[PDB]
Design a protein around this ligand. Structure first.
Ligand SMILES: C[C@H](OP(=O)(O)OP(=O)(O)OP(=O)(O)OC[C@H]1O[C@@H](n2cnc3c(N)ncnc32)[C@H](O)[C@@H]1O)c1ccccc1[N+](=O)[O-]
Length: 246
């Protein structure tokens, strides 16, 4: 069994080659929050309103396939209400969903104040949803690496200050940057390599694609062609093993 076979057995595909000697140098670790430190999967964390309002909103969201709509529908079914028939349905990307039941106009869209999701009935907002991501069952062995070489650990996210801080508390590392953009991330990575730091970065979806390509060693989850490594196993722990045995 080659080095490619032994690494694959341990959940890791090595597309690169010299990546092994590169890792020895690494002094800083950066996570892109969504999809790496979480499953990247919205659920409803709270609903404010009554059951009739909840059934209307689910009925209209049942005709969409956007992951926000699927989460609302699934929450409503857990609460025991059922799906009702909708006329004149229209979906409007970037905004949300609209439709007609028992002679009332129902819209579901971003709230006028927050990132909350709001339910409008004949033009008045009568209910709302708080929607969050799902955290991977933690490895406090982050601390086992905070110990090891006392490496520097950083977290980048695009989500709002409320949401990215709470996670930064859930596990204990005191250095995160929230409210970011794909090109803001690239800027911070530059600004550190431009300080001679050797960076390993872990990423997943759309945003991180670009800063991964910018990393000394880059790692992409199992769910592009830029990553030195692929965690087909989606087991962050397995990687933490690789790091603390480098
Ligand atoms: C992917 C996900 O949500 P996201 O990343 O916000 O999806 P996005 O692509 O930015 O949405 P857009 O750009 O299509 O629509 C912009 C805004 O219009 C509203 N909006 C849009 N569609 C709808 C709808 N069907 N119903 C209600 N409101 C809607 C709504 O207020 C939406 O934010 C999610 C959520 C939580 C955790 C983790 C993940 N995750 O990444 O897996």
């Amino acid at each position: 069994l080659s080095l490619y076979e032994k690494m694959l057995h341990k959940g890791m595909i090595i597309k690169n080659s010299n990546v092994y000697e590169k890792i020895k140098e690494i002094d800083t670790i950066i996570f892109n929050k969504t999809g790496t430190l979480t499953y990247g999967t919205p659920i409803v964390t709270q609903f404010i309103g009554d059951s009739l309002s909840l059934a209307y909103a689910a009925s209209v969201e049942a005709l969409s396939s956007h992951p926000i709509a699927k989460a609302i529908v699934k929450y409503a079914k857990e609460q025991g209400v059922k799906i009702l028939e909708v006329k004149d349905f229209k979906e409007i990307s970037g905004i949300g969903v609209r439709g007609k039941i028992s002679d009332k106009i129902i819209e579901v869209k971003k709230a006028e104040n927050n990132n909350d999701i709001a339910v409008y009935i004949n033009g008045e907002p009568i209910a709302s949803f708080n929607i969050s991501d799902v955290p991977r069952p933690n490895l406090k062995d982050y601390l086992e690496k905070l110990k090891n070489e006392g490496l520097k650990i950083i977290i980048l996210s695009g989500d709002k200050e409320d949401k990215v801080k709470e996670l930064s508390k859930e596990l204990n590392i005191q250095e995160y940057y929230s409210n970011l953009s794909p090109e803001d991330k690239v800027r911070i990575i530059e600004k550190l390599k431009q300080n001679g730091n050797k960076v390993l970065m872990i990423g997943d979806g759309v945003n991180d694609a670009a800063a991964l390509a910018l990393a000394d060693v880059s790692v992409a989850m199992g769910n592009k062609n830029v990553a030195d490594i692929i965690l087909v196993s989606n087991d962050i722990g397995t990687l933490l093993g690789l790091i603390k045995n480098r």
